[PDB]
Ligand SMILES: *[C@@H]1O[C@H](CO)[C@@H](O[C@@H]2O[C@H](CO)[C@@H](O[C@@H]3O[C@H](CO)[C@@H](O)[C@H](O)[C@@H]3O)[C@H](O)[C@H]2NC(C)=O)[C@H](O)[C@H]1NC(C)=O
Ligand SMILES: *[C@@H]1O[C@H](CO)[C@@H](O[C@@H]2O[C@H](CO)[C@@H](O)[C@H](O)[C@H]2NC(C)=O)[C@H](O)[C@H]1NC(C)=O
Ligand SMILES: CCCCCCCCCCCCCCCC(=O)O
Ligand SMILES: CCCCCCCCCCCCCCCC(=O)O
Ligand SMILES: CCCCCCCCCCCCCCCC
Ligand SMILES: *[C@@H]1O[C@H](CO)[C@@H](O)[C@H](O)[C@H]1NC(C)=O
Ligand SMILES: CCCCCCCCCC
Ligand SMILES: CCCCCCCCCC
Ligand SMILES: CCCCCC
């Protein structure tokens with residue numbers, strides 16, 4: 001039960017938030033999905049439109065690899081502050 | 089200087105924000121005062137009113153007691169971060185804020201007996217329903233309800249400090265359409281199955297001022313309705329004149345109606361002014377229908393009977409309608 | 419002459435159906451004195467309760483909704 | 487007493503992980519109390535609603551025995 005705990009602990013330890021995945025390697029390809037929840041308004045006078053969406057980004061990072069845990073780890077959202085993410 | 093510094097230093101340490109005063113003891117009694125600075129705007133459309141006020145609580149805390157310092161201490165407002173305060177909040181609030189310029193408009197004051205006075209400058213958009221069934225001849229019953237989110241009466245109690253003098257500054261308020269008639273204070277406890285929660289209520293009664301409507305809504309309608317009756321004295325053969333007068337009076341009432349609703353609050357709610365305008369519309373409509381009857385019966389088929397009776401019935405019936413309207417709505 | 423059934427629906431954002439499941443405790447939901455409500459265009463006819471599973475790219479999520 | 491118990495429960499307890507991370511789904515019981523269904527702004531196709539939303543669940547990690 002605590003196996004996941006210390007697994008995630010070692011995953012976060014020694015993690016460099018500064019550097020992208022494969023800093024010295026080839027560029028990292030970031031896949032993207034959008035789920036348009038709604039288009040709230042389209043303003044001719046302002047020449048803009050509001051848009052609500054679920055914006056999802058996929059990317060492979062070798063630092064965040066784990067074994068012995070045959071389940072996808074959904075973590076608390078605050079962890080996003082501790083990992084590298086694209087500057088989209 | 090240094091003695092005051094070490095006094096406050098020892099006061100701060102050993103103090104736990106996570107625990108209330110006398111946690112194992114009786115409930116802490118919190119006196120509450122208000123000084124209203126400005127009721128910025130009262131909206132019928134949203135059924136709410138914005139209110140800027142100096143809210144003040146007042147409570148005894150043994151932990152914050154100090155001696156040897158007869159002068160009262162007005163510490164920096166940031167010190168309020170490190171001191172426990174009630175969980176007070178307003179139930180009928182939709183949005184509120186505390187003014188931040190130049191510094192956060194907040195104040196904490198300690199007293200030698202260990203009492204705390206905690207003041208804030210709150211601009212809150214409180215909610216009150218408005219029975220607009222009698223608009224504009226209506227009086228509203230708007231309230232600010234103040235309660236503790238988590239604590240029951242067994243853990244904290246609220247009362248009005250100063251009694252009826254708890255709330256001041258009402259005379260300084262001059263709303264642009266309403267006139268404050270009375271304000272009332274109610275301290276009570278709302279009882280549920282689990283326990284009773286304290287509550288305070290500040291209820292203003294607001295009377296609406298109608299001189300705007302009397303001069304740009306009612307008087308034009310009455311005068312167009314009379315100008316419609318002018319048709320009954322025009323000679324019956326003057327079809328062009330009488331029809332033009334009647335139809336243009338109907339158009340003028342339609343114009344008054346359509347351009348009035350542009351200015352009144354955007355609420356699809358039926359109101360007294362709507363009844364008055366509909367009645368005047370029906371009266372001008374009947375005035376034109378009267379000439380329809382007259383032209384068919386005599387010209388189409390010694391004033392005639394229909395005009396003779398209309399000249400008395402229409403003013404008399406409109407006076408009766410006005411009497412019933414003003415008696416029912418006032 | 420229109421009637422509407424406006425929903426209010428909620429669910430987990432990151433946790434799929436196999437991680438967090440929601441349930442109505444008892445009696446669905448409670449309403450106070452409807453005379454105190456700020457409805458003037460419309461009148462409240464009655465509410466109801468619903469629970470379902472919605473499929474998305476992330477996974478299947480338990481969606482709990484209340485229709486007014 | 488209250489302070490020591492308050493500080494004791496925070497030992498360990500990675501909040502990163504939900505209760506029963508690898509065992510079963512976490513069952514959450516929800517209650518809603520509608521204070522008021524505010525005005526229905528048909529222009530923007532929306533409506534305001536004030537609610538008291540109370541959710542409850544079970545976390546064995548927070549168990550503590552005391553009076
Ligand atoms: C964790 O996430 C991975 C990736 O989302 C999950 O693996 C994927 O599982 C689904 C079925 O649940 C597989 O879908 C099927 O794949 C076949 C082969 O292409 C296709 O014919 C079917 O129509 C369907 O799409 C999917 O291929 C598989 N892999 C990927 C990369 O999507 C995994 O199950 C999740 N959970 C666990 C416990 O690992
Ligand atoms: C410090 O504050 C206390 C309480 O606010 C003051 O105590 C009151 O002072 C006024 C006038 O000085 C008296 O009329 C009251 O009887 C006092 N007691 C209460 C309960 O109001 C105190 O005077 C202040 N210190 C000063 C002005 O030096
Ligand atoms: C709801 C009001 C409907 C009004 C319909 C327009 C009728 C106006 C003209 C009526 C002319 C008089 C016809 C009856 C004459 C008679 O009784 O001898
Ligand atoms: C709107 C109410 C006021 C008008 C009251 C109208 C009463 C009319 C009475 C006279 C009816 C007979 C008219 C036909 C006379 C004829 O034979 O030429
Ligand atoms: C209800 C607020 C008081 C409004 C007072 C309005 C006074 C209007 C005076 C009208 C005078 C009309 C003279 C017409 C003949 C020249
Ligand atoms: C609300 O949910 C409960 C639990 O699923 C169910 O027993 C109840 O019948 C539902 N409400 C209605 C309107 O039936
Ligand atoms: C809908 C308001 C109707 C008011 C009365 C109409 C005038 C009747 C005059 C006999
Ligand atoms: C708003 C109530 C108006 C009632 C009108 C009754 C008709 C009076 C004229 C006959
Ligand atoms: C409204 C006018 C009625 C006349 C009936 C003879």
Ligand SMILES: CCCCCC
Nearest residue numbers: 396399400401403404
């Ligand atoms: C014949 C004249 C009647 C006047 C009613 C006001």
Ligand SMILES: CCCCCC
Nearest residue numbers: 310403404406407410
């Ligand atoms: C105040 C209403 C007056 C109407 C006179 C016919």
Ligand SMILES: CCCCCC
Nearest residue numbers: 407408410411414415
């Ligand atoms: C002419 C009568 C008017 C009555 C207003 C109450």
